[PDB]
Every structure is written in C-alpha cells, then in structure tokens.
Amino acid sequence: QNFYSLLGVSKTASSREIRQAFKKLALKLHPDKNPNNPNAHGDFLKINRAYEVLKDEDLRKKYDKYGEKGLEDNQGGQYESWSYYRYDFGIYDDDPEIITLERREFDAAVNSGELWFVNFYSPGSSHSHDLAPTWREFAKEVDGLLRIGAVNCGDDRMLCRMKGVNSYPSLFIFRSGMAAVKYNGDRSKESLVAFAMQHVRSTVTELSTGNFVNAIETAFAAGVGWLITFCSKGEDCLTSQTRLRLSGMLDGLVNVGWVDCDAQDSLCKSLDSTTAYFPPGATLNDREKSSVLFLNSLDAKEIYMEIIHNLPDFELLSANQLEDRLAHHRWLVFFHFGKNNDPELKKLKTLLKNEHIQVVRFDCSSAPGICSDLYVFQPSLAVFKGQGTKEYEIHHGKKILYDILAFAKESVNSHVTTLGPQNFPASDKEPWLVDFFAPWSPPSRALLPELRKASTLLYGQLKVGTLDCTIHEGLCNMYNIQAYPTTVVFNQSSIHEYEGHHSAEQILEFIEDLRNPSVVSLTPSTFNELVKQRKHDEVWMVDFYSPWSHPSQVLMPEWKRMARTLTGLINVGSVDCQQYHSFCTQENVQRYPEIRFYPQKSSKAYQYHSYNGWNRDAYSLRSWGLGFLPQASIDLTPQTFNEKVLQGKTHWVVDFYAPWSGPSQNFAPEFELLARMIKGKVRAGKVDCQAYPQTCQKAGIKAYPSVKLYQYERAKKSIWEEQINSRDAKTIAALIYGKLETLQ
Ligand SMILES: [Cl-]
C-alpha cells in the first residue's frame, strides 16, 4: 500500500530491501540535510514512520491487515542523525556476497554445512569502518569458496554477547562440525584468505604418469571427475595456492591434481599453459578428446565457474525408485515437470552428508499422481524425513545454498507437518498449532524456522502444521485469514490466535499460557482441594457455567480478560455445570452463569458472595472482586491531611473523591490495591471532598476522583506534589517507584 509505495518497494520486499530504499530517502531528506524548510521534520516523518512499521514485523502485520487505521500514532518520531544513515546504517546492504545475519537465523545459517566467516561489527566503531571495504573485497574474492557474513552488534547485542564478541570488530569462523574459531590477524584481504584456507578441506595430488592414467581410468566408477593442471618449466600453470582454492571450491565434486610435465615428458606429448577438467570417463587419448574441457585461465573463480556449470545434475529417480525409498532415508527432492537454478546447488550432495540427507530430482511428468497427491503443481523443492514416515516440508524463498541447507537440516530434525485438506485436523480433540501462511510473504518465511524450533520442544504436547494459502486459497478463506502469517492454536473446540513476535521463545510462552490459563478450570474434586481448603489468605473468583447458556457464553471472554488482570492477586476458577451437574447442584447453583467470590478465611466471613450486579463485563467483575480485599488507605480529615501529608516526612498517594461520584466508586477498590502494593514504601490516603470541600478546594481538585502523589525530599525538608492521571494500580505504582529511586 502507501507505506511500500512511500519507500518505493514491493509488499514482498525483504528487510534488506526496505533498509536499502529507506537509506536512499533518508540521506536526501533528513532534516539535517535541508535546514531551509520548516517542514523538514514532517517530511521525514512520513518516510521514517513507514520504515519503522515495515521493519517491525508485528507492526507490519497490522498494516497489512488494516491500513494506517489499525496502527497507532506514536511511531516514526525518533530518528538517528544524518551521519548515522550515511556511515553507520546498512553498511553491507549493497554487497550481494555478504549475508546480513540477525539473531533468529544465525545459528542455523552458520552451521548449515558451509565454511562461514562472519564479521561482528558495530556502529560508532572506527575499527569496524576500516574493515568494511576489505570485507566487501574479501567476500568478492572468496565467492564459491566460503560464506561471508556480517552481524550488526549495534542491532544485535545479545547475539554478539552470546558469541563471545570482545571487541569491535570481531571475526569468527564457523562450521557445523567445530566450535567457532577467532581470527586475530591484521584484517588484510590476503591474510583473511590464508586464515580461511587453513580451515578449508583441500586435497590436491601430484600425479605420476602411472597415477594419472589410473586416476583417469578409475574416475568413472568413482563418479568424480578430475581437474588437472600440467606444469612445465619456463611456462605458467596454476599456482599452489590456486589449486588448493579450487580444491576447496569443488570439494566432493571434483578431484584436483597437477602433473610435472618435465617429469612426465611422454605423457605431456599428447597435450602439446593448460588446465584440463576430465568428466568421469573422459581420457586424454584422441578418442575421449571431446568430453575433456581444456582451460587456459590461471584464475580460480574463472575456472570454478566453468567447472560448476559443467557438472552433472542431481540423480534422477524414477517413480518406482521414489516410492521405494521415500519413507526410509531422508531425501531432498527437486520436483520438476519435463523440460528434459544455481549450479552452486550441486554442492548439496556433499554438504548434507553429515545429516544423511540424500539429494535427488524427480520428473513429475513421469508420474503426475505422485506430485499432485503432494499438491505439487509447479517445480518445487521438498525434504522428506523418512524413518518410516512420509512427513515432508516444502522450501520457500530464494533457492540459495546455505538457505536450502539450513532448511533441510532444521526440517528433518523438527516436527512441522505440511498440511493439506486431506490431513487437516478438522475433527481432532488433540492440540494443534497451525500456521496459515503465504510463501511470497517475507514475515511468513521468517516464521517457519521459529515454528520448527518450537516443534522440537512441543513434541508430545501438540502437533505443529503449516498450510500454504497460495495453494489452498479455499481453506485459508474458511478460517478468515486476512494477513500472512496467521498463527493459530486448536484446542478443545476453542480456537486461540497468536499475536506475539515471530520467535520460538514467545510462541512457547503463548502456548504455555494456553496450557496453564489464568482461568483455572475446576472439577468437583479440585474445587474442594483448592477453593474450599484455600489457605487463610487466598481468595477465589469462580464462574459456574453451562456451555449451553447464552449468558454463560457471553461471560467467558470477559471472565478470561478479567482473570489475566488478576494474576498474583485473586485466584480465578471456572466450573462446567453441564459436565458436573450433581456437584453444581451440591453447591446450589440455580442459574447460569453464577459468579461467586470466596473471601479470606476470617471470624465473620461469609461462605461466599454471589455477584448479582447488572453489568458482567471484565472491569465490573474485577472491581467487584478487588472490593473484598483489605483497605490499606487511611481516611483523612482536614487536620490529618495537613499534619500527615503536607507537613509529614514521607511519601503519600491521595485519592480525592466524592461518595456520590460514580467514577469514584469504580476506582476505590483499584486504589486499595495500589495502597497494598506500595505498603512500606508509600502511604495511601483518601479525602472525602463532599465532607471536606475546604481541603479539596485548597489541594487543587477540579473533579472526582483525583489522585495526587506527595513526595518527601529529606534534603530540603519538603513535600512535592504531582497528579496521577492513570487509574491503573500497576501503572501508577511503577510510575511512583520510578520517581523514588531518583532521589535515593
Ligand atoms: Cl572501536
């Protein structure tokens, strides 16, 4: 919509693309840049608000479901300096060979199988600035050899702390098999390369005449061809460093070697300066001439690019082979349709070995029913978990190597199912976590890995599934999905919708709350053990309800909201009288819903109180509940107000009220809660303005109820007076607490 149009990007744009577009606009339009128009702050607000809501995935989701209308105003107001955007912002955003990593995807990325070299840098760090051009250059230098990453510690403090970053910048080498190795050298292009090579697997072998023939003649069965450079004195061939680099770049795909032609003159008479790639089966003799690839270049990247394009495609499996193998080993399958992608992907076979994931392709046209039964209607990449099952997931996003590796290893070790209409849990009492998403949606793709993580911890607790809305438009329409992604738990015919941040931790919290809800569901047994035999200071609110009762159905969502606000204050329970008829009869429950409060055990306490109030919303019920709790405020007089508060030596919070005032009666139980929370820190008082207009006039009270904070400063022997506009006990308290330490 307008925000994407404002930044001039698509609604499918990535975080990086957003930052790129905003950087262009920020450098031209920062209020620092043009001091000649008084509207400079306002013009930048439009762009910065758009940027801040789009870079925030929670905010972005609200903006996709509703326009700016669903958002709230306090955004875009704060921005950094012009110099920040010019020099500290998106430093590696325009450098394609550098992967910009955030906290969520970091571990899965740098452990996906490739050798990673990551620059943990920081804004306001001039050592980080010095490194940047070298890093861009270095990343260009080793393309095809290893993965180069960057992590902005400025926006990723905790990740940098957890990864032992002790200075800016800090350089680490990652590979799944080992612990991080730190580079401590002088940050030069050539030093960084040499360091990385010590961690690169590289086998180059000098070949005798006898060895060369044997390697070439045995190459075919092995499946691996040969890259060989032929060296004569007075002539130039691949250097030692170059052969080792090529060996690393083509690890597991090609054997690298060299031949000393001065030492093998007879052999080199056949050739004629030159490196040759021999596909498996190809020989030097004039028969096998053609398949052999003769190269003249001395440059690794140049040579590599020719080899990588020349290598064979993935093994093609027949329909029979596929069906025989899929439920057992793990299989990464490229699905296509006849017609018979980065060549870099050919490295998947080698780099997935440690996870025993086999890599193949399949031609759906040879068996369309197999692909249509998986709802594969276009070329697709899927990974199957095997081990006796046909669980699979489909890869979404750019078909780039490290991402497909991270996807494949994370998925086969997780418990997220691909859902379709045929196995959708419409009829299931067991708990399900379902993610309705779209592949084109950048947040949706950001969610999938976090879901996989949660799945591993939730195993045995609930099943996790994903549903593709672009494919199954009908299914997501029936669940009223308006934005992507939409995460939803299904538990006992009630369907809860997640609204937190897309991280495994927050998702685990949300589910843990659904597993131990504020509203404690009770049985006839648990009522006796928890409510009846509550300790001599516990209190309970309990809703006795029938699922068949319209009044009960309308109450429950209010009951739950109320329960959430009473955590650590009032125990909240619920009783199903349809299931437990005799018990509810035992308790003399006559109509639904019946709301009862179970007070603190005391000498004069009733067994319980039934709420007969007209209004049954959450606020009314909360205020009713808190009304039974103990008074902690003091009822002040005109004299005691002056002596104890105005001329006292402590902190007060005072409620100026009128008995006839509706709003005052609503607040009274909230004020007592406030009083109890601050007991020992602050004293709480109440002043009847109807009884004492004299004092309320002097104190500056327009209407009722009003709250005033009185702070004592011992240094000046004086009382400070401020007004509290909030009517929320927790809010007021924290607000009061904040001021208190700032004198101590
Ligand atoms: Cl520094």
Side-chain angles (χ1 to χ4, degrees), residues 2-24 26-27 29-32 34-35 37-38 40-45 47-67 69-73 76-77 79-82 84-160 163-200 202-232 234-268 270-271 273-286 289-338 341-352 354-389 391-428 430-481 483-511 513-605 607-648 650-713 715-743:
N2 184 74
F3 282 175
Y4 301 95
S5 292
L6 242 190
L7 307 190
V9 299
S10 165
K11 65 154 180 188
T12 65
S14 69
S15 292
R16 193 160 172 178
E17 307 183 294
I18 299 275
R19 284 191 309 268
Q20 287 180 296
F22 169 67
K23 188 178 187 182
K24 293 171 54 188
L27 282 183
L29 233 230
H30 200 280
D32 287 340
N34 197 11
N37 59 315
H41 168 74
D43 302 331
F44 190 72
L45 249 177
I47 288 130
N48 193 240
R49 202 211 173 187
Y51 168 59
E52 279 267 56
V53 51
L54 289 180
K55 87 204 247 191
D56 186 339
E57 335 90 63
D58 176 85
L59 290 199
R60 182 177 192 177
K61 213 256 231 48
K62 279 113 189 250
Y63 182 73
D64 293 343
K65 192 176 302 183
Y66 327 97
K69 304 161 80 76
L71 291 194
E72 85 200 48
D73 252 30
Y79 42 98
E80 234 60 71
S81 67
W82 176 95
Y84 176 91
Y85 294 126
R86 184 48 182 78
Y87 285 107
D88 273 331
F89 182 68
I91 256 44
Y92 299 119
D93 281 9
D94 271 310
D95 311 294
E97 23 282 316
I98 299 180
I99 315 299
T100 53
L101 296 166
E102 75 165 351
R103 189 185 188 187
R104 287 193 313 215
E105 72 242 9
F106 185 81
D107 298 87
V110 305
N111 290 310
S112 59
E114 287 171 306
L115 191 59
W116 284 76
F117 200 0
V118 176
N119 169 208
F120 290 91
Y121 77 102
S122 180
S125 179
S126 288
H127 282 175
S128 299
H129 279 51
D130 299 340
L131 176 60
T134 292
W135 204 244
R136 299 183 178 103
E137 179 83 41
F138 174 53
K140 280 163 172 177
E141 181 60 63
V142 298
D143 182 63
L145 178 71
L146 65 110
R147 227 67 214 201
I148 302 296
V151 162
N152 190 335
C153 292
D155 297 348
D156 257 275
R157 247 124 219 168
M158 185 57 68
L159 176 60
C160 290
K163 298 308 169 179
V165 174
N166 52 321
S167 35
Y168 296 141
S170 297
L171 315 178
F172 288 81
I173 286 274
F174 302 91
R175 198 165 202 163
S176 62
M178 27 157 270
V181 182
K182 182 171 210 257
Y183 172 86
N184 293 307
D186 71 285
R187 313 201 237 112
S188 64
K189 180 232 223 75
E190 320 216 29
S191 183
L192 291 168
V193 167
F195 175 79
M197 291 303 306
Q198 251 287 83
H199 304 304
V200 168
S202 58
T203 303
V204 312
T205 72
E206 189 182 339
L207 307 176
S208 66
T209 301
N211 282 336
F212 162 84
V213 160
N214 193 242
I216 281 309
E217 281 189 359
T218 61
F220 191 69
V224 190
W226 273 89
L227 179 68
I228 294 163
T229 177
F230 302 77
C231 330
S232 304
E235 234 305 314
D236 268 317
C237 62
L238 299 188
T239 70
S240 199
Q241 201 168 343
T242 298
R243 298 190 296 260
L244 283 175
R245 276 212 209 168
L246 281 175
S247 193
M249 301 171 88
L250 296 173
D251 193 354
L253 292 163
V254 177
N255 290 307
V256 179
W258 67 280
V259 162
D260 195 340
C261 278
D262 310 287
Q264 334 284 332
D265 236 273
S266 261
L267 172 63
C268 295
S270 318
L271 298 83
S273 287
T274 270
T275 300
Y277 169 66
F278 302 77
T283 100
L284 198 54
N285 311 127
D286 286 35
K289 44 154 193 197
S290 71
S291 188
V292 177
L293 187 75
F294 290 93
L295 307 171
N296 179 95
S297 176
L298 303 156
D299 186 69
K301 284 176 257 34
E302 176 157 11
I303 294 162
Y304 166 80
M305 288 310 305
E306 296 208 44
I307 317 291
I308 194 69
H309 276 106
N310 221 246
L311 290 181
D313 205 343
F314 302 116
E315 173 179 7
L316 174 69
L317 291 196
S318 66
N320 278 5
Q321 284 174 327
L322 189 74
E323 288 174 293
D324 276 312
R325 305 180 182 192
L326 264 187
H328 307 116
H329 281 283
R330 320 207 269 221
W331 295 88
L332 185 71
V333 184
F334 288 79
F335 284 109
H336 58 88
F337 283 86
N341 262 345
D342 197 344
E344 169 193 79
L345 292 190
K346 294 168 178 168
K347 293 186 193 184
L348 280 163
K349 179 116 153 122
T350 308
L351 293 153
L352 278 178
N354 276 19
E355 283 289 344
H356 308 95
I357 301 176
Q358 325 290 318
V359 184
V360 295
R361 57 190 165 94
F362 178 84
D363 182 11
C364 297
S365 294
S366 70
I370 286 176
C371 295
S372 64
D373 287 344
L374 292 163
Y375 299 102
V376 169
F377 300 114
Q378 51 177 300
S380 300
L381 171 61
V383 72
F384 295 84
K385 308 176 199 273
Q387 301 194 10
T389 78
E391 301 239 309
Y392 70 97
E393 292 186 77
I394 294 170
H395 181 263
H396 307 294
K398 246 82 210 67
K399 296 293 173 280
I400 190 143
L401 181 58
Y402 66 92
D403 193 66
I404 293 175
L405 288 163
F407 158 76
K409 295 184 175 189
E410 180 180 45
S411 178
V412 303
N413 287 296
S414 303
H415 304 275
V416 173
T417 312
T418 298
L419 289 173
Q422 35 164 100
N423 66 355
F424 200 90
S427 159
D428 191 7
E430 317 269 12
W432 270 88
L433 173 73
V434 176
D435 170 18
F436 308 81
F437 77 107
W440 56 260
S441 157
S444 294
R445 301 201 297 277
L447 182 53
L448 298 175
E450 292 306 307
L451 225 67
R452 302 202 174 95
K453 294 172 186 149
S455 70
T456 65
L457 292 164
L458 270 11
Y459 187 69
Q461 191 170 307
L462 52 82
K463 318 229 158 87
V464 186
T466 61
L467 197 96
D468 193 336
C469 292
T470 61
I471 294 188
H472 309 102
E473 276 173 17
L475 205 47
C476 297
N477 276 324
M478 119 167 43
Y479 291 90
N480 221 58
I481 310 306
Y484 304 120
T486 299
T487 308
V488 154
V489 182
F490 298 93
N491 183 50
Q492 308 290 37
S493 283
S494 200
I495 321 302
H496 313 85
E497 169 176 348
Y498 181 62
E499 255 298 329
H501 162 60
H502 295 334
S503 82
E505 172 196 294
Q506 275 195 48
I507 290 167
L508 289 153
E509 286 209 8
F510 167 81
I511 284 180
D513 172 78
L514 297 187
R515 192 161 164 257
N516 310 98
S518 288
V519 177
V520 181
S521 187
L522 295 159
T523 63
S525 298
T526 42
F527 183 86
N528 188 28
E529 301 167 282
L530 291 187
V531 178
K532 251 145 193 179
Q533 300 197 25
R534 63 197 184 275
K535 287 219 244 156
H536 334 275
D537 50 325
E538 296 172 32
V539 303
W540 277 85
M541 297 179 73
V542 172
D543 159 36
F544 293 86
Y545 72 94
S546 165
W548 296 74
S549 180
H550 167 281
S552 293
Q553 297 176 53
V554 156
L555 176 57
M556 191 45 78
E558 300 277 353
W559 193 249
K560 291 189 181 308
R561 262 176 283 99
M562 182 203 77
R564 275 201 94 94
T565 191
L566 290 168
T567 300
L569 300 172
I570 292 176
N571 304 282
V572 179
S574 73
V575 167
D576 192 325
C577 286
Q578 250 252 165
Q579 171 163 352
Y580 300 126
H581 189 56
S582 275
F583 171 58
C584 285
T585 299
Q586 180 174 98
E587 301 301 301
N588 196 37
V589 172
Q590 301 308 95
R591 310 253 179 270
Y592 320 107
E594 156 78 297
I595 295 166
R596 294 189 183 165
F597 180 90
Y598 297 88
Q600 291 166 123
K601 313 275 185 65
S602 81
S603 300
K604 307 171 307 309
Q607 229 160 5
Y608 62 82
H609 308 260
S610 285
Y611 181 73
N612 209 29
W614 182 274
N615 293 312
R616 273 181 296 193
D617 65 287
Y619 294 160
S620 302
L621 293 181
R622 173 187 169 82
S623 199
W624 183 68
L626 297 176
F628 297 99
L629 295 179
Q631 189 189 8
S633 73
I634 300 178
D635 299 296
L636 294 164
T637 64
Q639 283 317 313
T640 53
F641 180 67
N642 294 279
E643 305 170 0
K644 294 183 173 161
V645 187
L646 300 181
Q647 306 154 11
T650 26
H651 318 294
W652 286 84
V653 56
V654 182
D655 180 16
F656 301 88
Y657 71 107
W660 48 257
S661 173
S664 280
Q665 295 153 6
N666 289 134
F667 180 60
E670 196 73 34
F671 189 72
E672 291 312 322
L673 163 60
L674 175 56
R676 297 190 298 271
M677 289 166 49
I678 57 184
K679 247 294 158 57
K681 278 282 187 173
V682 181
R683 303 206 74 190
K686 299 183 70 176
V687 177
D688 189 336
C689 302
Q690 177 184 240
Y692 320 119
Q694 61 237 240
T695 299
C696 285
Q697 169 266 320
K698 258 165 219 123
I701 297 109
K702 340 286 209 183
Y704 323 109
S706 283
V707 180
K708 292 213 166 208
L709 168 66
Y710 297 85
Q711 287 177 264
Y712 186 68
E713 169 165 8
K716 291 293 184 177
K717 304 175 267 278
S718 182
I719 290 294
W720 298 113
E721 164 196 9
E722 271 177 74
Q723 279 223 60
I724 321 291
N725 289 317
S726 159
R727 295 305 188 252
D728 182 84
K730 286 239 159 241
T731 305
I732 301 166
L735 178 143
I736 296 174
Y737 283 149
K739 320 200 63 114
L740 288 200
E741 351 154 71
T742 63
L743 337 174

